[PDB]
From a paper:
A crucial event of the splicing pathway is the catalytic activation, which takes place at the transition between the activated Bact and the branching-competent B* spliceosomes. Here the inactivation of Aquarius leads to the stalling of a spliceosome intermediate—the [name] complex—found halfway through the catalytic activation process. The cryogenic electron microscopy structure of [name] reveals how PRP2 and Aquarius remodel Bact and [name], respectively.
After identifying the IBC as a complex that delivers Aquarius to the spliceosome, we reconstituted the [name] spliceosome on MINX pre-mRNA in HeLa nuclear extracts supplemented with IBC carrying the dominant-negative Aquarius mutant K829A (IBC(K829A)). We reconstructed a cryo-EM map of the [name] core complex at about 2.9 Å resolution. Focused 3D classification allowed us to resolve the peripheral regions of the complex and model in the BRR2 helicase, the PRP19 and IBC complexes, and the 3′ module of the U2 snRNP. The position of Aquarius was primarily the same in Bact complexes and [name] complexes, but notably different in C complexes, which indicates that inactivated Aquarius prevents the conversion of [name]-to-C complexes. By contrast, PRP2 occupied different locations in Bact and [name]. This result indicates that [name] is an intermediate spliceosome stalled after the translocation of PRP2 but before the action of Aquarius. Despite the moderate resolution around Aquarius (around 6.2 Å), a comparison between [name] and C complexes showed a repositioning of the helicase, which suggests how it might operate. Arrested between the action of the two helicases, the [name] structure revealed how PRP2 operates at the Bact-to-[name] transition and implicates Aquarius as the helicase that promotes the conversion of [name] to B*. Finally, Aquarius enables the dissociation of PRP2, plus the SF3A and SF3B complexes, which promotes the relocation of the branch duplex for catalysis.
Author numbering:
A (entry chain D): 3 to 91
B (entry chain B): 10 to 16, 18 to 80
C (entry chain E): 458 to 601, 604 to 621, 629 to 656, 682 to 689
D (entry chain C): 490 to 1304
E (entry chain G): 160 to 190
F (entry chain N): 759 to 953, 959 to 1019
G (entry chain I): 53 to 73, 77 to 87
H (entry chain A): 223 to 441
Write the structure that this text describes.
RNA sequence: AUGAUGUCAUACUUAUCCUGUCCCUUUUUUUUCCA
């Protein structure tokens, strides 16, 4: 369900909280699964602060729900990898 | 690949030298011996050595891993 | 800029591990030192093969699957095949007729038979070694048929009890010139069942 | 000279054309030889580079790095080129772009750290008296950046010499603009200089010049905002002439004095703030009729600041300010401007939260019944926000009935698609709670009257109101009324419009969720045969709401519908899985799991095994997902012999479906599937040994999800057994299968451990082939990035070679 | 046509100066 | 910018162009890009002064970017076609009259006017078939063309035929060698080129719906105009391959 | 899938093997 | 902001607390040289670490601050440091709020083999031992009670040795608690040979003469 | 003996996604003719 392009930031996560839209709600932010969503998503930057306020960290809809890492990704601890909010390049 | 992964410790390719990989492995081993509390205690209580002297020896061995390069 | 195979044989302790093209590497001594350990694996030979990995079989057919013993003891295959053959003999008119009016009884045998097949009748399979490399073959070389040891068919058809009829000839010839490292127990090296030597 | 300029051009082309390591080396060489080349050609090559418009963002960032390193390595060597750097970076100091303004502030900080603040003060001393407004504002921005770079008292005696002097009012205006910009830039850093800034600005605060007095009041307001909440005794020097200036100043000076009074009012003493609020509220009542839009916005901001200011009581405010506020500011002209309407709504919500929302509700109940649609929607949104803030406890029953009649009139004249007033309707009625039980039947009768409309959207909005109000209807548990409305909606179920049908279906979803189980009329066996041809509709919202209602029914009520009808519903859902919405397919999977929990897992698994091999199209991954849910909710030990026998079908897609359902099921169950690893071993081995590499890709997904699932349970021997096929299968070509190989390798390195992965990678990274060695090196680099912790312990023993010491004596030094 | 011959006019303009009307960027009430 | 009048103010005796007296000065980046464009043109020396060709391209009042039409004329001829093109692309009002309603009739006439190789050849066919058509209003009515602006374009064509002895360029033509005509067009249009992206401005391109090549987005296209209305639009495009693009201004061109 | 033993040719569709009827060249090569 | 380069590598560093607690400086330790300097116009006061009077240890082991603790009063702060021998040397601060001038490092008490030492107030001084007993000490004197010599940073020398500060008596403070730690437990021998309710486990541990076998029996 | 290689159709992958665009104004040099 992923793409070879569209890297997000690869920048270390801070206090700006991730946020999911309805069009891709419930999926994981990394492997897009639905099994035990464990860890809150932090998006490291002005990915939340400013123009993209309350927006999707995935495709681009109106962000309504807190984005979660799943327990399968936090088994290898992919939650510390950084910002998953997509910046188009 | 990724730019941050290239900036991360452990980036290597087929063009990476064996001596450079061994130097990076020795630097990572010195960093792991500095970080581990049990391994540093085992390295310090082996002889009549101080903890600050062992830390200075580890800081010297970090540069000594790149000390005699190719 | 590089040494030959005889110089690599003199320099390294494992001259058989020195490959033909590994001496053309940037660090052939480091490659030989890495390959000299007992916990190393080779490169799969598709890098040397023009044919791709598991693609060029192209003229054979294989059986699809063999079920494990607990699954065959539960026996889902018989009424599954009966249902599949009944569906094949059904027309498509009968197919949406049975769609709009369904019927009972798919299998409905029990639950604890399948539960015991999964747990109590569970058998661990023969998992191979850490250093196994699979290729186009890698499922057929099971003879290592020991050298100096006969087979079960040779024990049965020639009347050899667990005494071969060629045992005196093998002991008179001693070690054979084909396999000088072969051991023939009972005639040459004084051995249970088919494998009567090593 | 010429050779130095040629070397400067060579380093510039190496920075702008070579590799970024070569650019960093050229920047290091420029920082080394800045004293050799001089700041002359350095400035004469940097100012064309700063003036180049087509430079890249990375190019100007590297230019900022080079200028910072050259300034650190040269310091006062660019002292004659202070004026050239100032005239280059004065557009950069007044840059409208935020990143360019930050880079200009960093360049100004570098220039202040290198050359010195005295040269910049001598440069800006003739520019302090700039009568031109744009030139004076550029000088104000540059002097604010210089004051932030060099601190307050580096230029505070110079500012006290300039601003207190009466040389020109333009110089005074520019200096007070410098003071206000520096206070806005500093914020909390102007707190120790609060009395100094008050003494500096007290001379211009009573100036006869209107612009100088206006910028002095603006700087006083900016200082009161910046030093919040310190410097109250510093700002109390101009406390007494502020009340006199509220009566003396007119126009823009009056607005600046009112803004300074509103900024100094929450930092004052409570008796003093009460006396000043009582003094200035009479002027603010006269300031309610300000015809200017910016002046009215400033007055409304002052009203919001006075509402946020404590110590001004509540009864005095509600008696004095609020009926002129509703007379003047609550008007259609203020509501038409959307910034003014939003500011008016926020100020009214803040005032209602400060002094009770009952007064605002009683003053806006008629404006909710006003005939203007956008004005009434803004009023109803304000009443909804006030009810969400305070509550309905302060609302009397007659005022609540009047508000109910007003919002029912608003729903009558709700011409637009205004769901915000529907949400406000639900908010006010939910805040009423159990008090709407007298209000229930006339509201229900009017909604049923609107449900007889010619217009589809009117009945659609009425059904949406039913969906919003089902919960608050069942709060008092009006079971007979809820059953009667369920029977009426059961009659309404034959609607020919899809949006109306979806709204009706969502209303029924809410009603079934709020009634209780044994208390709806008609019951579940009297409803699901009616619901059965509804699922044959082709509209997406109807399908989504009907599948959600079937999910709630098959979740709760399995005890009314025969399993024949349940698998007929499954037969319908097999055709319904080809819908475009992944949420619809996911809820279809959920209904399949509910029906498998209800009726038993045999016939539904036989049906899905028939369907999955028969689909073979751009679907059926959801069929594998549904098969995984049927297994996982209902004990996959039963399901696994049937799926294992269905793997033996040679039909070229059923094996891919078996493996996809296996991967999804292992990901769903996690650690409970440790006993089935021996069962899934030979099928995964045969799929990895299969000639069709899509089967090997999906088996790699199986291995990845199993390594995700049962890590820490002794399955590493079977994981290594499957990895004995996976690691030979690293010769893949397609991106999908090589991503599956990478994910399975990451999962196996997580599962078994880093030592076996290092034993695999170290024997392949030294390959003579560049591509194979680079691929194994990338795999090893990914494994080391994942497992850099235990890699030192898992590193093999290597002796010290002739290059450096490699046999580590730290391992030998063991206590 | 060469590389440094296209920058002597920019060097002369940098030595002369920059006028506020020469590229008047409209910006007011900045914060 | 000042791309039409920098050449004229240079040829009317002013070398201190940015030091020249005015009410307000122009932006210096416009002057710098005009001078660097003139460096990429064959109009300025290394000292930034007009040549004989730089004076002769100011004899005629068209833009220098459209005077490299004339400078590529008589290089390998095709002069008449590109001189007609340089006349008709100097129009003020836009070509083609597509009103409210009708639509499909004007579209079908315009599609009949379409030729591959950009809309310059399309409107060149418009002017070519308007020649030997009596120069009638009935032609432009039935072909949905404004009969006010392209009459001024044939007047510009008459004037530029008259103003040819001062630059000493004949009215040669290659007689249907329109790929060589496009070679001269590309010899003119080297600064305004693009690969779905402009290679100089680094902007993602968008093709106008009124262009003749709105469909079939190419690997290499030049353009004439950079007007943003809703998107970063490409106005008056032409198909290229960046072969003879590398021939003209090689100092401007590097790394494909 | 369909296998042509006269060519050792894979076929995903039956029409691929039906059109595979070069086939006679490799058939005559295997006949030798 | 600041970058002070040192040719000698910094094994450890102790920072003087700025403001009213003293200068805003740091003392980088080396072999018999604690360079105290501040970020600004301050002198690099190289306080020599006071060696023992006729020390029997070889001079290859340079005296460096293995454990350092700044025990601060209401105004000033003393610095207790342990050398390569590990003796507790209390150091004053005669900086006089201008530059680092004098740090009167006098060996106030002889200290045992301690991995770390932290000296709080109200009679609290916890010295964690690498081998042996970790010592919690209560203050008796003012901390400057040194029976050994004083090596100040402003005290001149011949640039070859320091003040010959031999092993002094513990006059500044008294170790009120000595909690014995089994680490580093090298050898072990657990048996029920002794008459006890549980078996005696003898863990042989410690370094050199500061080494013992602790036999523990429970019940 | 299995490689290179052509846009040839069919297959499959991706819980891939169900799809967007027509400009306000505006000025720019020079030469012959029959009873
Ligand atoms: Zn995940
Ligand atoms: Zn989304
Ligand atoms: Zn980010």
């Amino acid at each position: 369900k992923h793409h070879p392009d569209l890297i997000f930031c690869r920048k270390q996560a801070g206090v700006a909280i991730g946020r999911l839209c309805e069009k891709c709600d419930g999926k994981c932010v990394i492997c897009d699964s639905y099994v035990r969503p464990c860890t809150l998503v932090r998006i490291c930057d002005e990915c939340n602060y400013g123009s993209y306020q309350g927006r999707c960290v995935i495709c681009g809809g109106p962000g309504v729900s807190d984005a979660y890492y799943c327990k399968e990704c936090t088994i290898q601890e992919k939650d510390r990898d950084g910002c998953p909010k997509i910046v188009n390049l | 690949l990724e730019h941050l992964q290239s900036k991360y410790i452990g980036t290597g390719h087929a063009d990476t030298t064996k001596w450079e990989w061994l130097v990076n492995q020795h630097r990572d081993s010195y960093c792991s011996y500095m970080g581990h509390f049990d391994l540093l205690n085992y390295f310090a209580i082996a002889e009549n050595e101080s903890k600050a002297r062992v830390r200075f020896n580890l800081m010297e061995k970090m540069l000594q891993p790149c000390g005699p390069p190719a | 800029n590089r040494f030959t195979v005889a110089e690599l044989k003199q320099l390294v302790a494992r001259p058989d591990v020195v490959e033909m093209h590994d001496v053309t590497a940037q660090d052939p001594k480091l490659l030989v030192h890495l390959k000299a350990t007992r916990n190393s694996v080779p490169v799969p030979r598709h890098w040397c093969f023009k044919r791709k990995y598991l693609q060029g079989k192209r003229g054979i057919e294989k059986p699809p699957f063999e079920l494990p013993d607990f699954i065959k003891r539960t026996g889902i295959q018989e009424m599954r095949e009966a249902l599949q053959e009944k569906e094949e003999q059904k027309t498509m008119k009968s197919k949406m007729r049975e769609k709009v009016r369904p019927k009972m009884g798919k299998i409905d045998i029990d639950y604890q038979k399948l539960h015991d097949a999964f747990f109590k009748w569970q058998t661990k399979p023969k998992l191979t070694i850490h250093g196994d490399l699979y290729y186009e073959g890698k499922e057929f070389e099971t003879r290592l048929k020991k050298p100096g040891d006969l087979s079960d068919e040779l024990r049965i058809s020639l009347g050899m009890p667990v005494p071969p009829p060629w045992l005196i000839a093998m002991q008179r010839y001693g070690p054979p010139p084909s396999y000088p490292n072969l051991k023939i127990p009972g005639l040459n090296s004084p051995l249970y069942g088919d494998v009567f030597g090593t | 000279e010429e050779q130095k300029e040629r070397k400067i051009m060579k380093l510039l082309l190496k920075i702008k054309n070579g590799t970024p390591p070569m650019r960093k080396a050229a920047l290091r060489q420029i920082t080394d030889k800045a004293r050799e080349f001089g700041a002359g050609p350095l400035f004469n090559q940097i100012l064309p580079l700063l003036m180049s418009p087509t430079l890249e963002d990375q190019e100007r960032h590297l230019l900022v790095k080079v200028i910072d390193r050259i300034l650190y390595k040269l310091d006062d060597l660019v002292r004659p080129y202070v004026h050239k750097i100032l005239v280059v970076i004065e557009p950069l100091l007044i840059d409208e772009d935020y990143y360019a303004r930050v880079e200009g502030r960093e360049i100004i900080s570098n220039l202040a750290k290198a050359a010195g603040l005295a040269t910049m003060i001598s440069t800006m001393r003739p520019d302090i008296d700039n009568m031109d407004e744009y030139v004076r504002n550029t000088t104000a921005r540059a002097f604010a950046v210089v004051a932030s770079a060099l601190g307050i008292p580096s230029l505070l005696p110079f500012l006290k010499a300039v601003c207190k002097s009466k040389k020109s009012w333009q110089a005074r205006h520019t200096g007070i603009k410098i003071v206000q910009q520096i206070a806005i830039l500093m914020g909390c850093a102007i707190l120790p200089h609060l009395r100094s800034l008050v003494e500096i600005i007290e001379h211009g605060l009573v100036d006869e010049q209107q612009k100088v007095r206006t910028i002095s009041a603006l700087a006083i307001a900016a200082l009161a905002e910046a030093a919040t909440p310190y410097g109250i005794e510093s700002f109390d020097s101009v406390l007494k002439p502020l009340w006199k200036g509220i009566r003396q100043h007119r126009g823009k000076g009056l607005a600046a004095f009112l803004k300074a009074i509103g900024y100094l009012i929450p930092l004052m003493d409570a008796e003093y703030a009460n006396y000043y609020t009582r003094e200035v509220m009479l002027i603010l009542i006269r300031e309610f009729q300000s015809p200017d839009e910016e002046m009215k916005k400033i007055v409304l901001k002052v009203v919001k600041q006075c509402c946020g200011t404590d110590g001004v009581e509540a009864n005095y405010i509600k008696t004095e300010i609020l009926p002129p506020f509703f007379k003047h500011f609550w008007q259609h002209r203020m509501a038409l401007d959307r910034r003014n309407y939003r500011q008016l709504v926020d100020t009214t919500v803040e005032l209602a939260n400060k002094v009770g929302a009952a007064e605002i509700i009683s003053r806006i109940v008629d404006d909710l019944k006003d005939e203007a649609e956008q004005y009434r929607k803004m009023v109803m949104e304000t009443i909804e926000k006030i009810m969400g803030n305070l509550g309905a406890a302060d609302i009397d029953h007659k005022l609540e009935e009047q508000l109910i009649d007003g919002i029912l009139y608003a729903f009558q004249e709700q011409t637009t698609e205004d769901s915000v007033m529907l949400n406000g309707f639900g908010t006010v009625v939910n805040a009423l709670g159990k008090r709407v039980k007298p209000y229930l039947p006339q509201i229900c009768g009017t909604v049923l009257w609107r449900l007889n409309n010619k217009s589809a959207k009117v009945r659609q909005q009425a059904a949406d109101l039913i969906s919003r109000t089902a919960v608050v209807m069942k709060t008092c548990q009006e079971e007979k009324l809820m059953g009667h409305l369920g029977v009426v909606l059961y009659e309404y179920l034959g609607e020919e419009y899809p949006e109306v049908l979806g709204s009706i279906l969502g209303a029924l979803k809410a009603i079934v969720n709020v009634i209780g189980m044994h208390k709806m009329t008609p019951p579940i066996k009297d409803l699901l045969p009616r619901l059965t041809p509804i699922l044959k509709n082709r509209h997406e919202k109807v399908q989504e709401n009907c599948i959600d209602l079937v999910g709630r029914i098959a979740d709760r009520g399995a005890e009314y519908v025969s399993a024949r009808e349940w698998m007929r519903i499954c037969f319908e859902l097999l055709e319904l899985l080809k819908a475009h919405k992944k949420a619809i397919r996911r809820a279809t999977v959920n209904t399949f799991g509910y029906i498998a929990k209800a009726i038993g897992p045999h016939d539904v698994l036989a049906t899905l095994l028939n369907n999955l091999k028969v689909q073979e199209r751009q679907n059926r991954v959801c069929t594998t997902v549904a098969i995984a849910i049927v297994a996982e909710t209902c004990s996959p030990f039963t399901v696994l012999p049937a799926l294992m026998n269905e793997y033996r079908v040679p039909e070229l897609n059923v094996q891919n479906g078996v493996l996809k359902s296996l991967s999804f099921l292992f990901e769903y169950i996690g650690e409970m599937g440790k006993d089935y690893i021996y069962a899934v071993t030979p099928l995964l081995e045969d799929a990895l040994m299969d000639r069709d590499l899509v089967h090997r890709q999906t088996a790699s997904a199986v291995v990845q999800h199993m390594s995700l699932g049962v890590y820490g349970f002794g399955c590493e021997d079977s994981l290594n057994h499957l990895l004995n096929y996976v690691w030979p299968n690293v010769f893949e070509t397609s991106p999908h299968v090589i991503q599956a190989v990478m994910g399975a390798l990451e999962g196996l390195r997580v599962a078994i451990g880093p030592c076996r992965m290092l034993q695999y990678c170290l024997q392949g990274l030294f390959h003579p082939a560049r591509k194979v060695r680079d691929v194994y090196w990338k795999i090893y680099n990914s494994i080391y990035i994942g497992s850099q912790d235990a890699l030192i312990a898992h590193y093999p023993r290597i002796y010290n070679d002739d290059k450096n010491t490699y046999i580590r004596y730290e391992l030998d030094y063991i206590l | 046509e060469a590389v440094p011959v296209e920058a002597y006019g920019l060097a002369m303009l940098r030595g002369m100066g920059w006028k506020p009307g020469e590229g008047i960027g409209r910006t007011f009430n900045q914060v | 910018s000042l791309g039409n009048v920098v050449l004229l103010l240079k040829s009317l005796g002013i070398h201190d162009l940015m030091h020249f007296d005015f009410l307000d000065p122009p932006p210096y980046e416009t002057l710098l890009l005009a001078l660097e464009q003139l460096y990429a043109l064959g109009a300025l020396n290394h000292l930034g002064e007009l040549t004989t060709s730089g004076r002769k391209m100011a004899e005629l009042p068209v833009d220098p970017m459209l005077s490299k039409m004339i400078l590529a004329s008589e290089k390998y001829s095709c002069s008449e076609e590109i001189l007609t093109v340089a006349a008709m692309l100097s129009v003020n009002n836009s070509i083609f009259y597509r009103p409210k309603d009708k639509v499909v009739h004007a579209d079908n006439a315009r599609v009949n006017f379409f030729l591959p190789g950009g809309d310059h050849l399309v409107l060149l066919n418009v002017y070519t078939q308007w020649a030997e058509s009596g120069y009638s209003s009935q032609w432009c009515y039935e072909n949905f063309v404004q009969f006010r602006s392209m009459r001024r374009a044939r007047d510009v064509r008459e004037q530029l035929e008259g103003l040819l002895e001062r630059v000493e360029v004949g009215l040669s033509s290659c007689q249907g060698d329109y790929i060589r005509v496009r070679k001269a067009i590309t010899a003119g249009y080297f600064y305004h080129t693009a690969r779905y992206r402009t290679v100089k401005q680094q902007q993602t391109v968008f093709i106008h719906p009124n262009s003749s090549l709105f469909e079939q987005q190419p690997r290499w296209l030049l353009y004439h105009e950079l007007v943003l209305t809703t998107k970063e639009f490409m106005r008056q495009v032409l198909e290229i391959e960046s072969s003879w693009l590398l021939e003209v201004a090689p100092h401007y061109y590097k790394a494909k | 899938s369909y296998e042509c033993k006269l060519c050792l040719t894979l076929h995903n569709n039956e029409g691929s093997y039906l059109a595979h009827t070069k086939h006679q060249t490799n058939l005559a090569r295997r006949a030798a | 902001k600041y970058s002070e380069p040192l040719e000698e590598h910094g094994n450890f560093l102790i920072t003087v607390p700025g403001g009213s607690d003293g200068p805003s400086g740091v003392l980088i330790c080396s072999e018999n040289y604690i360079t105290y300097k501040n970020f600004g116009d301050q002198p690099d006061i190289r306080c020599p670490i006071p060696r023992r009077r006729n020390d029997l240890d070889d001079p290859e082991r340079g005296m460096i601050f293995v454990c350092s603790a700044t025990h601060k009063t209401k105004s000033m702060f003393f610095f207790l440091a342990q050398t390569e021998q590990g003796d507790i040397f209390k150091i004053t601060l005669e900086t006089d709020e201008d530059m680092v001038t004098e740090i009167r490092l006098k060996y106030f008490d002889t200290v045992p083999v301690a991995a770390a030492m932290c000296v709080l107030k109200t009679g609290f001084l916890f010295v964690a031992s690498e081998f042996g007993n970790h010592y919690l000490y209560q203050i008796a004197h003012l901390g400057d009670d040194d029976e050994e010599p004083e090596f100040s940073s402003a005290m001149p020398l011949e640039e070859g040795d320091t003040f010959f500060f031999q092993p002094r008596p513990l006059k500044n403070l008294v170790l009120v608690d000595e909690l014995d730690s089994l680490s580093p437990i090298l050898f072990c021998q657990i048996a029920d040979l002794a008459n006890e309710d549980t078996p005696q486990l003898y863990v042989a541990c410690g370094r050199g003469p500061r080494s013992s076998l602790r036999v523990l029996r429970h019940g």
